[PDB]
């Protein structure tokens, strides 16, 4: 029994299959790990902000475009899934597939065949192994290869079959792919580790907030930065950047005080009436105009 | 005994029937799970806000229309049912059936025959298996098929009977169907899991708030966004979006303070006297007018 | 012994008679369930509001009419009875019998013969079985059938007797009937369950408030919405809606502070003097006028 | 021993005699039930207010008339007796006997012969059984029948004796009789239950306040509403309504602050001096006038 765990810990970058199996098994057959993973996926409030390294003339247009493109992708769910999966396996390789104007994400599931391998220019490089395709159905294989058409093609698989030991690995574009990792001490370590390994043999809140803050920063600077680059013109590359909040936010009372303080002489009133439970904005304005325009209460 | 639970946990995506049976059984035969599900259905306040990514000239009309369309569907009950059900099974497939102007929802019961299967363009695709219809009564089968007339038709069932291994699956529209899921680690995992599995072998409040907040976000961006798209014209597609509140709201005292502060010199008084127990608005205004107009108390 | 409870929990939608019998028995023979049900009936304060999706020209008339029609039905007692009964059985079917102008409610007792059965247009449909009438006395049966004259008639019972297996079920109008249910996980589940089932084998306050809040919302949007539709003209259908308060209200001190703050320069004084123990309003005004008009104390 | 209690709980609507006997016995032979009943009769502060659904021209006259008619009946004692008796038996049937101008109440003591039986128009109907009169003395029987002259008459008893199985039940006018009940889960249940049944086998404060609040509301809308209708003209039927307070009132300090705040420039001074211990109002005014008029202290 013990020897199995010892061997698994001997090579955390090779015995990944068993680690994932036990992780998924104890996710449902135990509560501690279940609470761990739902805490990972839940604790973040995912309030975000996009800022710039320069103030261009037409900035507001870029801000609106970035907000819209962040909604279209529906980021919050993607961030939560990425956090849960990286915590599960310790490493992950995604990519933006759709066209530049309206990109859509794609998350590889098998790490044994797609992973980061080395670095160049200080940035990771991820190589897809073509052996992955030996198991997918012919129709499914053709569909997938059509999915990555401009980057990978059926010709690549045919060449691989021609010489399995020559074209066994293919590089992915830097501007799209993103590898995420966690649990690596060395900056030159490829495969991370899963958070289940420590407590596996057994079968604070601000500490976890700070632990997930680094993952949020990594997702900001690896995933959504490339999206901003894709959506915006070439001139505005790396000019804008997105940040998530890692600390506990200020509650409703202080927010309401700040908003009501702001309103005085000009600033928006809608968001003032907005945070009040009930008291819908349109009902508020309609009844107010009825009372001030029709009845003329203030004259009586 | 133990082997049965071990096997159930081995394949959470195949042994769903027994999991649902045990979930429903312990809902009534025990209090812990009953409290769990009542807490899921009860804790949310379901105070909501629809906002826009742009300020159109006729915005107020859209806001009023969306509020009305949210009431007609009577959303709160639907949201509570969806939460309880997805927690029960871990996955759910609904669809907007009625016409675009006045849609009405429909929730499938058998996950084994209707489920999400894969993704395209980054979005889930749900395929209805026609074997489902092999058990319904002929009259009931015809009625149900007439229910989904434009999307599914009796001709599809006839073709399925002609070749059971060719037309065994049918796709549903993206603008209408919505799959919801919970308990999936990998972004490419279809079937979630039920919250009963962890504590099954056995037979904080802010943590649950945050756990259910993600469910509210998912239901916002999956269910009601499509409704907004249906109700509003094409030009305003995905322009508006609705958000539910996940944190504990500010109590009545602060609400009253903000409202009375707002009233000064112009803003509505109806919502001021409204929150006072008793003291109905009409009685208040009527007696005030009686005292100031007829008796002229302030002149004496 | 245990087998009986196991069988009862096996089919909560079939063994309802025994469940209700045990519920009523332990209501009086034990204090826990008695406290439970008295808490359901007592905790709500039943302060209510009526608001509109539009501000019509003659709104005040509609507000007054709705308040009067809410009093005539004497809603509070009806709401408490409905809550207690639905908690007792888990389901309930009522209807508005009297004419539209001054309707009066009617609550069926036998769920086994009157229940919701299926859905159409997203709304439940309740079917009355005619076998119910096989037990009532001929005079009583005729009286009851006269009660539901426009919707059900003696001709229906005669047809049922002609062919017991053809006219066995009858539909009720949507604008009048209302089914209420509780304890159902699946949105397509007809019969709820009683709150006694969990603790039956054995023989927080804000949690109960929130649990009863959902029932209050259900009664608001299912029971009294139809009443509002009946009383108001066709043009104002679904325009007005009623809401009960679910949280703990602000105490008397803050209420009096708000009222006195309001009174300044014009607003009603009657409710200010009203909430003071003793100090009847008419005595207050009469003595004030006596002192300021005859004695002229302020001149001495 | 146990079988007797089990049988009593089997038919709470039939074994009422023994329940009342044990209730009255343990009222004096035990302290718990004694505290229960004195708490019921004592806790309410019976501060009341009459409000209107409309503001008629001569409202003040109606307010004064209603206050006077509430004092003449000496409501507080009647309310306390009604609460104690309904708690004792679970049901009660009263009626207004005297003429409309100055009505006086009458509370039947036997429930086995006078009770509510069914409903019509949504309102309970109470039927007096004439068997009740078989025990009263001939002189006493004639006196009682003269008491209810316009409603019941000796002719009714003679007809009953003529055919005991035909005229065995007589209806009472709706505008006068009032049935009160408690302990009924079903809206179609006639006989309530006594509060002694739960703890009988054995031999918070805000919870009891809320429990008695519903009884106070029932007494308001069943007993005194009919009185208001009787006293006021036909045009003002159901226009006015009376409400008792169920929460703990604001203490003397806040009341005094509110009154002294009100007094400024015109409002009554008598109630200001009134709540001060000692310092009788007439002594206060007399000594004040002596000091300001005779001695002229303020000039010295």
Swiss-Prot record, chains A, B, C, D:
User: What taxonomic lineage is listed for the species of origin?
Assistant: Bacteria, Bacillati, Bacillota, Bacilli, Bacillales
What this protein is called in its record is: SPbeta prophage-derived uncharacterized protein YonE
Which species expresses this protein natively?
A: Bacillus subtilis (strain 168)
Supply the gene name: yonE
């Amino acid at each position: 029994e013990a020897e199995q765990l010892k061997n698994y810990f001997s090579n955390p970058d090779e015995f990944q299959e068993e680690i994932e199996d036990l992780a998924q098994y104890f996710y449902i057959s135990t509560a501690e790990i279940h609470q761990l993973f739902e805490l990972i996926e839940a604790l973040p409030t995912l309030n975000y902000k996009i800022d710039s390294f320069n103030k261009v003339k037409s900035s507001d247009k870029h801000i609106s475009l970035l907000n819209k493109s962040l909604h279209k992708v529906k980021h919050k769910r993607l961030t939560r899934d990425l956090l849960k999966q990286v915590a599960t396996a310790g490493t992950l390789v995604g990519i933006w597939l759709g066209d530049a104007k309206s990109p859509y994400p794609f998350i590889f599931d098998e790490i044994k065949y797609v992973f980061p391998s080395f670095r160049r220019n200080g940035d990771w490089v991820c190589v897809v192994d073509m052996e992955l395709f030996t198991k997918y159905k012919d129709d499914q294989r053709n569909e997938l290869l059509k999915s990555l058409s401009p980057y990978i093609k059926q010709s690549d698989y045919e060449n691989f079959m021609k010489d399995r030991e020559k074209y066994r690995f293919k590089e992915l574009p830097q501007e799209r792919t993103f590898p995420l990792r966690t649990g690596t001490l060395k900056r030159n370590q490829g495969l991370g580790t899963s958070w289940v390994t420590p407590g596996l043999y057994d079968v604070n809140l601000d500490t976890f907030y700070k632990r997930i803050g680094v993952l949020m920063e990594d997702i900001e600077q690896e995933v959504y930065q490339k999206l901003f680059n894709l959506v915006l013109p070439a001139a505005q590359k790396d000019n804008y950047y997105m940040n998530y909040d890692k600390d506990k936010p200020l509650t409703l009372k202080e927010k309401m005080d700040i908003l009501i303080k702001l309103n005085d002489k000009g600033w928006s009133i809608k968001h003032v009436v907005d945070n009040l439970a009930g008291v819908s904005w349109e009902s508020y304005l309609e009844q107010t105009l009825y009372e001030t325009e029709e009845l003329k209460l203030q004259e009586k």
